[PDB]
Amino acid sequence: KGAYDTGTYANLFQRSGYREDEIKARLEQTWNDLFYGDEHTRIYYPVGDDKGYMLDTGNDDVRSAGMSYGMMMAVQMDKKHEFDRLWNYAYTYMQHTEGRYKDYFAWHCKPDGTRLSPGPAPDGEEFFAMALFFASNRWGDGPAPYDYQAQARKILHACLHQGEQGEGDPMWEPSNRLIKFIPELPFSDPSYHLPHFYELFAQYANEQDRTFWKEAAEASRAYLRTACHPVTGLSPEYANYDGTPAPVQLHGDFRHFYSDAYRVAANVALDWEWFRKDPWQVQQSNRIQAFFSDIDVSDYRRYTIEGEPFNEPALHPVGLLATNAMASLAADGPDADSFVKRFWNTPLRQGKRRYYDNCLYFFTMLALSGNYRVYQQAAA
Numbered sequence: 001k002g003a004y005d006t007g008t009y010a011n012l013f014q015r016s017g018y019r020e021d022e023i024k025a026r027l028e029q030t031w032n033d034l035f036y037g038d039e040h041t042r043i044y045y046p047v048g049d050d051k052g053y054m055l056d057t058g059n060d061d062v063r064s065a066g067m068s069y070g071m072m073m074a075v076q077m078d079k080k081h082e083f084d085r086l087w088n089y090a091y092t093y094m095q096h097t098e099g100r101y102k103d104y105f106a107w108h109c110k111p112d113g114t115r116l117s118p119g120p121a122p123d124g125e126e127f128f129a130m131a132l133f134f135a136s137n138r139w140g141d142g143p144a145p146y147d148y149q150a151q152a153r154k155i156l157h158a159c160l161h162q163g164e165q166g167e168g169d170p171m172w173e174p175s176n177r178l179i180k181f182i183p184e185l186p187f188s189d190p191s192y193h194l195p196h197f198y199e200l201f202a203q204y205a206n207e208q209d210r211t212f213w214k215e216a217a218e219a220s221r222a223y224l225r226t227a228c229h230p231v232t233g234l235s236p237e238y239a240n241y242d243g244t245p246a247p248v249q250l251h252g253d254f255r256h257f258y259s260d261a262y263r264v265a266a267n268v269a270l271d272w273e274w275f276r277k278d279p280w281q282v283q284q285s286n287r288i289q290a291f292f293s294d295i296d297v298s299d300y301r302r303y304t305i306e307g308e309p310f311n312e313p314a315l316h317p318v319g320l321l322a323t324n325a326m327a328s329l330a331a332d333g334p335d336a337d338s339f340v341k342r343f344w345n346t347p348l349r350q351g352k353r354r355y356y357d358n359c360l361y362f363f364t365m366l367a368l369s370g371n372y373r374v375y376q377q378a379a380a
């Protein structure tokens, strides 16, 4: 049985020989540096009396995925002030109040809140909902727009039902229960599959949707089994419903192991830790750690899912190492402990591309310290 059932979370840093006091100090200093550090480290900026944003430093914009990550980090760290500022920002500037995308979030805006595209990014919506449910379960709801569980249910209603009221498209394909890359296109993104979150949407969503969320959890576990290369454990950034790499798109080649796909190993391992349902997740974690076992972080490239290295370097190599280390939540192979130590000995990334690395870095810091947790509906 998983942490969801037992309430006990693996502390892999403590398992590797780091002291309890060292671990929680390091987690606190990671929070301090990311949220309130120097101009070359921080990725969070407070705005006015009641708002705040996570900055994609590399792209000079604010992303629904980054905002939703910030909210997950804040609720996992018991930081209600930062949580409320981030949510109020996403609510005020990014959430559609009308049209084909009503209740969805414009995927990016300028720091001042000016929308740069109207279309959503479904990985944002699902993290928003999960963070909002945890905020409800930890702190209890407030007055709108801080009625956390009501806001979460509204997002997930749109995610399954959007094209019914009028026009628009759902973010889940009804026929196969799989999350889509965007509402309009019939393919997916393996990194967007969060079966562990769907298990919890099955507990918290609008009642009529709970069966679908349960089916989505199993469908996503099965999908990820089809998406990861059987030898390397590498997955493509964009993939067809059959799990094979999607066609080259107008905005890029997403067929290879690069930025998005790093999260797959981290997501697979967190589902293992929380629910312990699919033993393939141990083997997947072993395989990706074996692929990177004698690759130094300084040599991380773009790779074909078959494991062929490009000359082109990984844009986010610290992100990749963070996700490789987070796989130690599930891995039982010879590389598990080495990756925890390698991650411990890695500082936060600095400079203009640091945002994506440091997001993945923070989730790994939470997970490997036993602090990436389910906040349930339970007796106080």
Ligand SMILES: O[C@@H]1[C@@H](O)[C@H](O[C@@H]2CO[C@@H](O[C@@H]3CO[C@@H](O[C@@H]4CO[C@@H](O)[C@H](O)[C@H]4O)[C@H](O)[C@H]3O)[C@H](O)[C@H]2O)OC[C@H]1O
Pocket (backbone or CB within 6 Å): 056, 058, 059, 063, 064, 065, 107, 117, 118, 119, 120, 121, 122, 123, 124, 182, 251, 259, 260, 315, 355, 356
């Ligand atoms: O009309 C359509 C557009 O709206 C559509 O936009 C897509 C919306 O989702 C976007 O996905 C974002 C991109 O960021 C991902 O993380 C990035 C990983 O690479 C890093 O370098 C970067 O810092 C990160 O931000 C995030 O998971 C996801 O939410 C996608 O890129 C857009 O293409 O595109 C097609 C139009 O037809």
